[PDB]
Design a protein around this ligand. Sequence first.
Ligand SMILES: [Ca+2]
Length: 219
Amino acid sequence: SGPWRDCLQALEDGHDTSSIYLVKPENTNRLMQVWCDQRHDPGGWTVIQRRLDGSVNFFRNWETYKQGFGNIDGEYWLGLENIYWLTNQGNYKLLVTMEDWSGRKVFAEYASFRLEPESEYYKLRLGRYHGNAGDSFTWHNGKQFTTLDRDHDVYTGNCAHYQKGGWWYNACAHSNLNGVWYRGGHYRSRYQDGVYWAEFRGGSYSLKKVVMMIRPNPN
Ligand SMILES: [Ca+2]
């Protein structure tokens, strides 16, 4: 309590309880609330996205993805502008944790994760992968962000109209973590628009719980 540059700075001053914290990145006056996961190894994780229970609508427009939406103690998207300022104050790694409907938990980690500015459509910059979920994000490396009202992908249509999220769509997605949460995992739709990570359970399986979290990775 009392704004922190990120969840790691809060942890370093003794707040090791996972909860809601106030964050203000360096070199900005941008204040935000975040959920800090201070338990997952090694602590200091700032949650930028979380799916858990289908309570929040992720089929949203650009301004909503820019500013952030959802419930900070539940499902939410932190906001492209907030994520930009966070990821540009140092080198941050990205950890994606995922759980299927049978209790299996896997992860994908990227040693660097940065977004370009809104002037560059929040283009994704991703570093090297390790994990046991398989790498379904690197296909999206270098792609701009796309929403239902702003097409910036390399598909001749708008991928958000089909995959139903806001995402760094290519043509269209190997991961669709801002897609439609389907109870029970297995689903069938005209288009694969679920919360999927293709290398783990494929495009027709919606993951029960997903977290995208970031933390300084200084080297
Ligand atoms: Ca397009």
